[PDB]
């Protein structure tokens, strides 16, 4: 918040499981933010349920979300557009260009960006990490869903 509810801690995260199913007193990371910047952890915190709780202080941006609000437009730009054009070029016997657009999704020979082979064969990074962007696939008979 702009004005926190408690001075001793501004946010309380905690972890629940089978043996510990509910909240405990001072059993979590308790984050305190000053008037200047950096968020620290209140040293009265008990970090038994975690291994380490780090605070990313100078990271103020997250990468783009392929399962968020504008997810449908993101998957159409990087996956469904190179797969529609390369399918369409394959039907037209234009083979040297149809290979160029299939390799915007997957190159089995790797990728070379400025004279060096890359760590990935899948050019679409939400195929590199399998991110589900539909969790209701059996509502209708849809092979894409």
């Amino acid at each position: 918040d702009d004005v926190p509810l408690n001075q001793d801690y501004h946010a309380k995260v905690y972890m629940t499981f089978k043996k510990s199913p509910s909240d405990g007193t001072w059993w979590g990371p308790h984050f305190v933010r000053d008037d200047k910047g950096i968020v620290t952890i209140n040293p009265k915190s008990i970090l038994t349920h975690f291994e380490s709780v780090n605070v990313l202080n100078n990271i103020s941006s997250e990468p783009m979300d392929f399962s968020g609000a504008n997810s449908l437009y993101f998957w159409e730009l990087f996956y469904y557009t190179p797969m529609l054009v390369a399918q369409r070029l394959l039907h037209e016997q234009n083979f040297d260009e149809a290979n160029r657009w299939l390799k915007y999704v997957w190159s089995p020979s790797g990728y070379i960006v400025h004279g060096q082979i890359q760590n990935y064969q899948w050019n679409v990074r939400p195929l590199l990490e399998d991110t589900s962007w539909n969790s209701d696939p059996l509502d209708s008979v849809d092979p894409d869903a």
Partner: protein, 97 residues
Amino acid sequence: QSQLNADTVEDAFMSYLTSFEQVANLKVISAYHDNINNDQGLTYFIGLSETDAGEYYWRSVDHSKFNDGKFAANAWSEWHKIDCPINPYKSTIRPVI
């Protein structure tokens, strides 16, 4: 069409990427939630393009598709176009059901 070279598929991609830019740069003006309570139902938004005498879009998010701290991507619909002569004063515009 049939004669489909490298020059045609690059001009069609940039014509695709032009219309992609108009939807990615929308400004959400107002909203309306079609329930009493915020936990259930579904909320309808309204957008604004970056053209002068701009064009307004709308879409939905389903609050029954909210699971474990995050909306599923099935909650969101696509931006649907409004073909209507709309010219509100200082973004005084509201959807309603």
